[PDB]
Tab-separated table of C-alpha atoms and ligand atoms in Angstrom:
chain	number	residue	atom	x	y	z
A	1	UNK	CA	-46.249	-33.373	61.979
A	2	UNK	CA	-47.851	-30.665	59.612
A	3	UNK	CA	-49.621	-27.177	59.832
A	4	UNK	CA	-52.122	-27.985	62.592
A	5	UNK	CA	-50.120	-29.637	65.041
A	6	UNK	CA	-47.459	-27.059	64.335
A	7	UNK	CA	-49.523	-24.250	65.201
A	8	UNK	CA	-51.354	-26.016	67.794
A	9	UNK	CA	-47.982	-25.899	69.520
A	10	UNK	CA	-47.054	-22.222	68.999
A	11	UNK	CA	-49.917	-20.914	69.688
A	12	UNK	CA	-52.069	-23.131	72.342
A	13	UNK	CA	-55.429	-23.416	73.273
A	14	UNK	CA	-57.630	-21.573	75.824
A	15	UNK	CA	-61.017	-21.448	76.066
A	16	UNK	CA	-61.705	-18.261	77.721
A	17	UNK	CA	-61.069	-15.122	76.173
A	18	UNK	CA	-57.273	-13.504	76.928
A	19	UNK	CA	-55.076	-11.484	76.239
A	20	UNK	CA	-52.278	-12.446	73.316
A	21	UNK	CA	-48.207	-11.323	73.431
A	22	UNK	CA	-49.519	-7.786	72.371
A	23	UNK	CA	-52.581	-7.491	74.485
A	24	UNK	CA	-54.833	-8.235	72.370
A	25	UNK	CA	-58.171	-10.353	73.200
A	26	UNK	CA	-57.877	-13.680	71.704
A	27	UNK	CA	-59.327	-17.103	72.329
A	28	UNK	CA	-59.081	-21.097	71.510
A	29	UNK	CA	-55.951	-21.206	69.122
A	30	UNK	CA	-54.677	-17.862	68.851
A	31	UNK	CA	-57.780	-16.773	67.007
A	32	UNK	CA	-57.683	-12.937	67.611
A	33	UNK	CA	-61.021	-11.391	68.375
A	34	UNK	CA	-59.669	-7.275	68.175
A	35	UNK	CA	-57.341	-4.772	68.547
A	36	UNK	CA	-59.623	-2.943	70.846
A	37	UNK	CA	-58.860	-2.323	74.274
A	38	UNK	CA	-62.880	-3.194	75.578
A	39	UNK	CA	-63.606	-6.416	76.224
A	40	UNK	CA	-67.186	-5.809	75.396
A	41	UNK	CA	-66.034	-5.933	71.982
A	42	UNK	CA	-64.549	-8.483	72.330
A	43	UNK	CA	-67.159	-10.499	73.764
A	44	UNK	CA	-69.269	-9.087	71.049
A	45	UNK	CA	-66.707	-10.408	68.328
A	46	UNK	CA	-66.795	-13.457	70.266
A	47	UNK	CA	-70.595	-14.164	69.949
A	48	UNK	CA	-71.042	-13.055	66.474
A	49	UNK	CA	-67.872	-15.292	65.183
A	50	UNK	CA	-69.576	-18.286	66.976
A	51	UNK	CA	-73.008	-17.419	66.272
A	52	UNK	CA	-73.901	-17.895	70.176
A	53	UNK	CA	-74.480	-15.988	73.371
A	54	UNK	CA	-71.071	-17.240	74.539
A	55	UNK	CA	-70.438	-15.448	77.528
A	56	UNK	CA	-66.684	-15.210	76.440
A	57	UNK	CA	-66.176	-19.136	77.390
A	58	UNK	CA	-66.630	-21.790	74.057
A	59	UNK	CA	-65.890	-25.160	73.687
A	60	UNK	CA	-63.159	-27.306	72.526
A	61	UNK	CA	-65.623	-28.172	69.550
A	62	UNK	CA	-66.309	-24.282	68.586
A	63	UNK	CA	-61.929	-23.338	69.245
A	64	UNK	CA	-61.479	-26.112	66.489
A	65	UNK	CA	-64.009	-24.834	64.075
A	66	UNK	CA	-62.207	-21.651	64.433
A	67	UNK	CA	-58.696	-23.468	64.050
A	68	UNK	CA	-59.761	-24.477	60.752
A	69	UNK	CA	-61.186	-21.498	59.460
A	70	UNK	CA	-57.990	-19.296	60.498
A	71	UNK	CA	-56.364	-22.385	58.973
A	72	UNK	CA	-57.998	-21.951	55.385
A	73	UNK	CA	-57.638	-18.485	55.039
A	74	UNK	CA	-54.440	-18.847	55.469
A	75	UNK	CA	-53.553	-20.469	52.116
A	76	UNK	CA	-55.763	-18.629	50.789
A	77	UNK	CA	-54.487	-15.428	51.527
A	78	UNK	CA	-50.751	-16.368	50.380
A	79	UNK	CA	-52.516	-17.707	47.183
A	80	UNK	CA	-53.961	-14.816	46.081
A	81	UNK	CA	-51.011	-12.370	47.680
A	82	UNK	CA	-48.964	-11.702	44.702
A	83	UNK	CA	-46.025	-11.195	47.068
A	84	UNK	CA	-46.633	-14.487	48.500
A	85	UNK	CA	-47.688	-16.869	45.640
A	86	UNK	CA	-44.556	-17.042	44.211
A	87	UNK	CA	-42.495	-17.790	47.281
A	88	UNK	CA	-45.260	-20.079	48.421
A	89	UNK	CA	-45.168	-22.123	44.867
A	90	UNK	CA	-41.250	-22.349	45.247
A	91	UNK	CA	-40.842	-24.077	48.254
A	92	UNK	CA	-41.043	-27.410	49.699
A	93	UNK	CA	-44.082	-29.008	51.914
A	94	UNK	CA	-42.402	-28.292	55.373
A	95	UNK	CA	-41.452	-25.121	54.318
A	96	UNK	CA	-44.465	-24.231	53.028
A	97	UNK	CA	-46.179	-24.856	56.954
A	98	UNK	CA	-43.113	-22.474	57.930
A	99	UNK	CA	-44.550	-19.206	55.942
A	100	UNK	CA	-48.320	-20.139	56.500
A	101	UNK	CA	-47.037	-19.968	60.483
A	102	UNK	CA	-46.018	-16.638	59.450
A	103	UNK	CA	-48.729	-15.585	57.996
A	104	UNK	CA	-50.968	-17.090	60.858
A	105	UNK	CA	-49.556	-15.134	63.565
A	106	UNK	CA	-48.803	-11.697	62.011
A	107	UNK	CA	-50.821	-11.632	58.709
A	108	UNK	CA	-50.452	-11.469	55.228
A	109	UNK	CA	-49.378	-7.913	54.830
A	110	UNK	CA	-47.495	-8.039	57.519
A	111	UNK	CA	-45.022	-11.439	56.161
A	112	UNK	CA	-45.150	-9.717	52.458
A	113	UNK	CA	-42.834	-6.605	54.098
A	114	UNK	CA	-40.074	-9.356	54.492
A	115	UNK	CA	-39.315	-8.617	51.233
A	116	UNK	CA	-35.553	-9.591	51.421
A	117	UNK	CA	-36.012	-12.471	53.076
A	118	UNK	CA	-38.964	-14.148	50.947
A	119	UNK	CA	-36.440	-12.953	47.724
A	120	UNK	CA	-33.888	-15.597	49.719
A	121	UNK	CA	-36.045	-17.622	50.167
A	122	UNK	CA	-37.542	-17.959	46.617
A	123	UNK	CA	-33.595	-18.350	45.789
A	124	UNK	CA	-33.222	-21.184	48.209
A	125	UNK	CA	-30.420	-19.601	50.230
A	126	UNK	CA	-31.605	-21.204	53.604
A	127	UNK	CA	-29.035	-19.795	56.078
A	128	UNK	CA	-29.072	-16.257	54.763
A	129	UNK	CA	-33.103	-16.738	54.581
A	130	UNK	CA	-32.606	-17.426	58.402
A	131	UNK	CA	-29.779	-14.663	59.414
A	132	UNK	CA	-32.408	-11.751	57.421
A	133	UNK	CA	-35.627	-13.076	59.101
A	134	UNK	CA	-34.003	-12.512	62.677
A	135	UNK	CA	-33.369	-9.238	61.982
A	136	UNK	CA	-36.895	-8.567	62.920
A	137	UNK	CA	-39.056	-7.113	65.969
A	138	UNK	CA	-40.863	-10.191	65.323
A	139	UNK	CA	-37.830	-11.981	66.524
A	140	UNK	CA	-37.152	-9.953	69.076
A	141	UNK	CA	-40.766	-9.982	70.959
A	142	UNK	CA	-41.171	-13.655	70.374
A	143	UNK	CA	-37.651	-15.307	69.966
A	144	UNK	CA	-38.647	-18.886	70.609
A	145	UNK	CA	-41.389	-18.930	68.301
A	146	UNK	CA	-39.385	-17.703	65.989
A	147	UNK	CA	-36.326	-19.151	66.331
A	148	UNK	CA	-38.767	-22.348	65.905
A	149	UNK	CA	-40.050	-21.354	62.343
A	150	UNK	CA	-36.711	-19.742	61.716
A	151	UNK	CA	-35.041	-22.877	62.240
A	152	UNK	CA	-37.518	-25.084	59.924
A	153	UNK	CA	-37.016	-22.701	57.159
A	154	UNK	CA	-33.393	-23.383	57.538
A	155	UNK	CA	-33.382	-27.257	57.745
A	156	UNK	CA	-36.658	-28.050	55.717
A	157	UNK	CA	-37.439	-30.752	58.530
A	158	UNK	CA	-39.507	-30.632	61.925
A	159	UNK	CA	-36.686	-30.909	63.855
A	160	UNK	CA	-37.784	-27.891	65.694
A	161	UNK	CA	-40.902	-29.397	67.004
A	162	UNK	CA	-39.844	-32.869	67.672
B	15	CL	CL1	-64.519	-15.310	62.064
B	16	CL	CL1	-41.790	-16.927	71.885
């Protein structure tokens, strides 16, 4: 197992535009395309993030490109998040695919506002980690998502996903 498998299970893969947890437009492996309630935006988005008239339909080619993009910034992102670095540097590989799931799904700034629980987390005490990040609306609008990561924080294994 590792990131991209990981993800490709929490999030899934469509190739038509729709509509995330929140509403927003989205397509191929939870890349968002806005926050804006038009889909003409979206499809607009869409077209210029492909570089293609896509009609709001891509391939399984183009949702991978994507994948790996979203992927990349990612790390990149923690790396040069001075809230994130640190934790990021601390832990082990399988946690390390934990936060960047994190940070896929709700975004850099929004993962560095767990400040208690990345503080646990840089100290290495797993089940208290675990007990602060459920105290979360992210737990509470996506529980088994988050119970997932929650749970591979705790352990350090894939358990979660086998
Ligand atoms: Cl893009
Ligand atoms: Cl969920």
């Amino acid at each position: 197992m590792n990131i991209f498998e990981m993800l490709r299970i929490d999030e899934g893969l469509r190739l038509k535009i729709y509509k995330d947890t929140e509403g927003y437009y989205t397509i191929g492996i939870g890349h968002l395309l806005t926050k804006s309630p038009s889909l003409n935006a979206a499809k607009s988005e869409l077209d210029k993030a492909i570089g293609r008239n896509t009609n709001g339909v891509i391939t399984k080619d183009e949702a991978e490109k994507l994948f790996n993009q979203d992927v990349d910034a990612a790390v990149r992102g923690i790396l040069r998040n001075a809230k994130l670095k640190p934790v990021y540097d601390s832990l082990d590989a399988v946690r390390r695919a934990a936060l960047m799931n994190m940070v896929f799904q709700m975004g850099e700034t929004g993962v560095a506002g767990f400040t208690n629980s990345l503080r646990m987390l840089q100290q290495k005490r797993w089940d208290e980690a675990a007990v602060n990040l459920a105290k979360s609306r992210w737990y509470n609008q996506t529980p088994n998502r988050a119970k997932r990561v929650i749970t591979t924080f705790r352990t350090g294994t894939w358990d979660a996903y086998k």
